[PDB]
Amino acid sequence: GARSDIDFYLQPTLNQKGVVMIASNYNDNPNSKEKPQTFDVLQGSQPMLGANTKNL
Amino acid sequence: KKVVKQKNHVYTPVYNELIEKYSEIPLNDKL
């Protein structure tokens, strides 16, 4: 399902039961496309590493 | 005759939202 411009960055390890992926999306669109206040927000999680703490 | 409530006429991406926020309960009426 991917496309031909993702530029898969591979950094292999040795002692790693499992394999972890990090998906990032730079904007790179030329209209306006600014970041909202780097999300100093207690309600929302910041959209770089979510650290999801939720059941309710 | 009955209509079928035709058109709102403006379009958008759907975006079932990715980044989640904690949902505090706003049942704070007077007390």
Added chain:
Amino acid sequence: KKVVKQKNHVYTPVYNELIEKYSEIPLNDKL
């Protein structure tokens, strides 16, 4: 009476296309 949607009137070779292209999925709405 009901019509049978007669004619578009312009013709072409069919050409069920030979050379194939990779079909990326364009479901890239807003995120």
